[PDB]
Design a protein around this nucleic acid. Structure first.
Lengths: 84, 180, 228, 131
RNA sequence: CAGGAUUAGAUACCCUGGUAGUCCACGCCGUAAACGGUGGGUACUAGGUGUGGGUUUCCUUCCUUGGGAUCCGUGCCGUAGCUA
């Protein structure tokens, strides 16, 4: 019915696309906590490493907050870090 | 009738596998002796060819000058690439005081009583270009009164107008002795 | 004096023309207002400059100058062709040559060789030389005819009057303003406007507006010649 | 910081003349006003006026361009600058362009062009050259 | 620094080993391409474009590189202007 751009029809969309994304305030969130590992496992790979911003979409604020949480989690072994 | 000059001849050389494919340049200035001034940088393998190019290109690129009888209006600074020149009017009977390049320019233009000084970029090319820039920076008092709405009396002093009147008198004398 | 009235002009639209990432006049009078991230006609200015250029060219063409229908933009090719048919003038379609108006005396020789080759064609000497060379002459003639029609009737110290595809052939303006004669084109609307003596706003792309105003200037020339 | 408001005035007019702007905007001062009135007299600019702003007044100047967009002001320059305060006797007044252009003197009789100052006989501080 | 190998010869690159040093505390010296090879402070001076941070209004879902304006910092292109 409508195109991904040339959105001359609805208001300025409260929706996200492939270039634009703020994935946490978007959806998939309760709150940034090192406790909730099922959520933090989404910003990784199967090899445990961490994504980038031009992969995910986050602002640096959320990015660094989440990375610190991840790293605390690996320290308290709540999350399977990559290793032997 | 035209007055013409040859005031620079260097022996240039592009370089190529055989050797040096020489060539010749020239700098030529033209002037009626009344205010028309033209400039040309002609070159060729042949010196007459370069000279003739300079001639015709000067006859293309004239430029009129704000004269008063035989002398300029005001002093001026002319900047070119690095050519600096400080022209300045004389009082009549003084002479065309300048070096080689500017002397050629002004003597061809028709000046007879003027000062000048080269302060940088001794090269004739940039010297001539700077002199020309100065002559462009010149302004006629008529056009000054035009652009700022006032009349010539409030715009100029009295001595310049003395010069105007006396030179118009000499000119009408010359023309009325010539034809009439 | 207007040419077309308000509502007939608003049928075709009086808003068009170009995107925001490219403009730079200094004239906030031509610059209309930000709408949809895009700018608009100032009909006051537009009709003013139209009447101004129109009276200028009425004077010049009751004196009886001449300009011809050379083509550069695909949007104006057939437009210029049909107005060439009906106003009678020769036309040209494809390409701009570097240095017509400046080096006119060499393209004059190009016309002379065009005449020579057409004379060969008319007299009919083809198998006097190689078939391949005659085919290459056909190549020469197609190229020379697509790139040259106007000199075939110019001959006559051309006036720097009119402009074809300004922004992309800026190279056609310095060939004109070098000599300084009054230039005109419907503004290619993301350009330096205040070079040209007689500017006229409009569009850069639209086939419809461009054919319209080509018919307008065709009409101007027609009236100048008619009341010569 | 700011130290030379008169240079600000003059340079601003120079910049705006080069950018071909129509009208200028400054804060206001008596000295700037007298300068502007003298220029409006001598012919360089069309008109000035005093609008206002949040904390203080403000000048607005209306320039003067040719019909063919010929700038009316060629050159412009401050002379007596802080540091080198240049003063002038009537005997040794500056002559600009042989007298075509204009000096702007500050004297017991107020701001005056060089001719008016000479006819009165007075002299004093110089402020600027204009042409 | 010792040895191996290349080498015309190799006090050198390459290989094997390997001390001072790199590290910590407390003091010293006080220099470099310590570079934007651009001293600091300040006003005006065409724009476009990405980008980091914080304000704010409208289509408003008002969960949005939302969009616009604004302020600060940061990069690219580019007028006039300037420069050998």
């Amino acid at each position: 019915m409508m195109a991904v751009k040339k959105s001359r029809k609805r208001t300025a969309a409260t929706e996200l696309k492939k270039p634009r994304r703020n994935q946490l305030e978007a959806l998939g969130v309760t709150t940034i906590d090192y406790k909730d590992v099922a959520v933090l496992r989404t910003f990784l790979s199967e090899r445990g490493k961490i994504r980038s911003r031009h992969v995910t979409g986050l602002t640096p604020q959320q990015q660094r907050q989440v990375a610190t949480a991840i790293k605390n989690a690996r320290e308290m072994a709540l999350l399977p870090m990559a290793g032997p | 009738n035209y007055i013409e000059r040859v005031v620079s001849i260097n022996r240039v050389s592009k370089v190529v596998k055989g050797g040096r494919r020489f060539s010749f340049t020239a700098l030529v200035i033209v002037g009626d002796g009344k205010g028309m001034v033209g400039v040309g940088y002609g070159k060729a393998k042949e010196v007459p060819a370069a000279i003739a190019k300079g001639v015709e290109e000067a006859r293309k690129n004239f430029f009129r000058v704000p004269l008063i009888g035989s002398t300029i209006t005001h002093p001026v600074q002319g900047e070119a690439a690095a050519g600096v020149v400080m022209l300045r009017p004389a009082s009549p009977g003084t002479g065309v005081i300048a070096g080689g390049a500017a002397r050629a320019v002004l003597e061809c233009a028709g000046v007879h009583d003027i000062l000048a000084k080269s302060l940088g970029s001794d090269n004739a090319i940039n010297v001539v270009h700077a002199t020309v820039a100065a002559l462009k920076l010149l302004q006629r008092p008529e056009e000054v009164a035009a652009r700022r709405g006032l009349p010539i009396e409030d715009v100029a002093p009295a001595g310049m107008l003395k010069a105007r009147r006396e030179s118009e008198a000499l000119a009408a004398a010359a023309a009325r002795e010539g034809s009439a | 004096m207007a040419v077309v009235t308000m509502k007939q002009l608003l049928d075709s639209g009086a808003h068009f023309g170009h995107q925001t990432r490219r403009w730079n006049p200094k004239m906030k009078r031509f610059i209309f207002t930000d709408r949809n991230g895009i700018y608009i006609i100032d009909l006051q200015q537009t009709l003013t400059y139209i009447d101004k250029a129109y009276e200028f060219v009425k004077e010049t063409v009751a004196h009886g100058g001449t300009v011809l229908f050379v083509g550069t933009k695909k949007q104006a090719q057939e437009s210029i062709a049909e107005e060439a048919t009906r106003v009678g003038m020769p036309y040209v379609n494809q390409r701009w040559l570097g240095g017509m108006l400046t080096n006119f005396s060499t393209v004059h020789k190009r016309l002379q060789r065009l005449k020579e080759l057409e004379a060969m064609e008319q007299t009919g000497g083809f198998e006097g030389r190689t078939k391949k060379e005659i085919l290459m002459l056909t190549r020469e003639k197609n190229k020379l005819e697509r790139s040259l029609g106007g000199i075939r009737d110019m001959q006559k110290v051309p006036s720097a009057v009119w402009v074809v595809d300004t922004n992309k052939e800026h190279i056609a303006v310095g060939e004109a303003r070098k000599l300084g004669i009054p230039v005109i084109a419907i503004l290619d609307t993301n350009c330096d406007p205040d070079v040209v003596d007689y500017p006229i706003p409009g569009n850069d792309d639209a086939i419809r507006s461009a054919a319209l105003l080509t018919k307008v200037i065709a009409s101007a020339v027609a009236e100048g010649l008619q009341a010569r | 910081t700011m130290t030379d408001p008169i240079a600000d005035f003059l340079t601003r007019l120079r910049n705006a003349n080069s950018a071909y702007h129509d009208e200028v905007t400054l804060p206001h001062s008596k000295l700037k006003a007298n300068i502007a009135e003298i220029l409006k007299r001598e012919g360089y600019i069309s008109d000035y006026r005093t609008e206002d702003a949040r904390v203080g007044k403000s000048l607005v100047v209306q320039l003067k361009y040719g019909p063919s967009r010929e700038r009316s002001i060629a050159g412009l320059r401050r002379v007596s600058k802080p540091g080198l305060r240049v003063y002038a006797k009537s005997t040794n007044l500056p002559r600009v362009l042989g007298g075509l252009g204009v000096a702007i003197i500050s004297t017991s009789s107020g701001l005056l062009t060089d001719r008016q100052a000479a006819r009165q006989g007075v002299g004093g501080e110089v402020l600027a050259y204009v042409w």
